[PDB]
Design a protein around this ligand. Structure first.
Ligand SMILES: CO[C@@]1(C(=O)Nc2cncc3cc(F)ccc23)CCOc2ccc(Cl)cc21
Ligand SMILES: [Cl-]
Lengths: 302, 297
């Protein structure tokens, strides 16, 4: 029993964190085999950030301009190349602690763990979700750039995020491990704004099924809804549209509890209308949206 | 910016998790040097049950490798299995007993394999509001200080309300619990006041000030109010511990106490603090300073 926001064990990722220094800039790198991946803005100055020409800044650098530190050991850089917004530094030593891994690009609504690091040293781990506006509500201070997001399935680490910037509202923007940003963001100090955020409807529904699995049913009602009527009401509260894919994904949880997706949708419509009336759902007074249907099955069923 | 419930990196603890099997029971063990620590209920009269057992009755698995037991002894509610091999991944460590209100990270394991990590606080009623399923027994709680892992908790049982009970690594229970199937209940819980105040300072540091007011209070008047709302009494020690956060934000501890009194008496009025509609009490003053500054391990 119990329901917590759980992060994946960070050990396999800790053994990959290194410190990358270029001139006066120090940030984090991900050392996998003989390559160190880090944000390409490590080559920029604060002035360069307004309108950086990364190709022109990189052509003026040599291998020995990049200092890479793994623990108390200096790695030797033997090559460098750019792939979108990530810099790939070829090193002379393969990481002996390289886990089984893959680079995956996630969609909004998907969750992942973040290992927050400063000076190549991990300081903490927390669980996140890619918001519908492509930002993450993380906890990052200066020097956390290059910190990574991941999931672990079986013995395989799936890297899905690398931290690059903090937006004016306090939210965070970054790229996949191929250097493609999530969202309409650029690694430029431009007037960039997150976009109006919405609630991940499929995740709130999954969390409502997790409350029913843990023995809480006070929010259920005798009503149903069509998918269209549910979406007309959901949009009025800034909830993401629920698609037929979302209804399909909730099938296993519907079969386990005996509550049809559209009947759980009717309960969500009523919660939006009435509020909780001093009650909580799984220790929360807000409707939780950072647990996917897959996370609920993993934490509850085994 | 940002404020999340952050756990310590679990790597140093992952390299110590093993599976312990005795008869039909399978649970988790902590392998440090040549000893494996696990709940004694893996085997009531535990010295009479233990005296029957031989070393080969305990099956210990570290990954896909079997460790052979060469000795066994009991320390309170913890069984210590002497193994033939010292763990080469043993970190720098110490066993520490924590007080209610203090927080720690939990590496939840099943069959000697870690599945997740989360942060939690020792409640005033000595229970933990964790997330544990069957097979999680022997999972451990810890803090990391520099390069040193301080083990403070080992999971033993779930109570009928869904909360959890366990021991320190010397086998002494936190709370009035016993490792036996009997009618045991979690006592009436209270809110950790010093932690709520620390979380209010973390909100001010992150730019949330709507709850601040021009008023201050006395420690006595605040405690008369706090006792009415099932909040733990705030001591002079608590006020002292909140000194650095008070100096950083410019808000005196009894000034922040007056803001907490208004939130208890009037609610949030449709508003939130750090994305929450409830007053959060599972962040200590030290966690707030560590997260809003940047300490690494
Ligand atoms: C070079 O890093 C920038 C940045 O957003 N850094 C940060 C990243 N994470 C957390 C942060 C927390 C802070 F308190 C301060 C800065 C943070 C600084 C501002 O301009 C830019 C413009 C674009 C890009 Cl892709 C990066 C940056
Ligand atoms: Cl995805």
């Amino acid at each position: 029993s119990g329901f917590r926001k759980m992060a994946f064990p960070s050990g396999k990722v800790e053994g990959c964190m290194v410190q990358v220094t270029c001139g006066t800039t120090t940030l984090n790198g991900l050392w996998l085999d003989d390559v160190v991946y880090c944000p390409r803005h490590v080559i920029c100055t604060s002035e360069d950030m307004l309108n950086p020409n990364y190709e022109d800044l990189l052509i003026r650098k040599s291998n020995h301009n990049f200092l890479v530190q793994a623990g108390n050991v200096q790695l030797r850089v033997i090559g460098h190349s750019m792939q979108n917004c990530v810099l790939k530094l070829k090193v002379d030593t393969a990481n002996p602690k390289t886990p089984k891994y893959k680079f995956v690009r996630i969609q909004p609504g998907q969750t992942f763990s973040v290992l927050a690091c400063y000076n190549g040293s991990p300081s903490g781990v927390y669980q996140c979700a890619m918001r519908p506006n492509f930002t993450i509500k993380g906890s990052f201070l200066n020097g956390s750039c290059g910190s990574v997001g991941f999931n672990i399935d079986y013995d395989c680490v799936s890297f899905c995020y690398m931290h690059h910037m903090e937006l004016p509202t306090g939210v965070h923007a970054g790229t996949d491990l191929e250097g493609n940003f999530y969202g309409p963001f650029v690694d430029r100090q431009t007037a960039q704004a997150a976009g109006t955020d919405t609630t991940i409807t499929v995740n709130v529904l999954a969390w409502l099924y997790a409350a029913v699995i843990n023995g809480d049913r006070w929010f259920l009602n005798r009503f149903t809804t069509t998918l269209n009527d549910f979406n007309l009401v959901a949009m009025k509260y800034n909830y993401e549209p629920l698609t037929q894919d979302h209804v399909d994904i909730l099938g296993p949880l519907s079969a386990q509890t005996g509550i049809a997706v559209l009947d759980m949708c009717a309960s969500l419509k009523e919660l939006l209308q009435n509020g909780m009336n001093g009650r909580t759902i799984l220790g929360s007074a807000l409707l939780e949206d950072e647990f996917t249907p897959f996370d609920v099955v993993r934490q509850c069923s085994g």
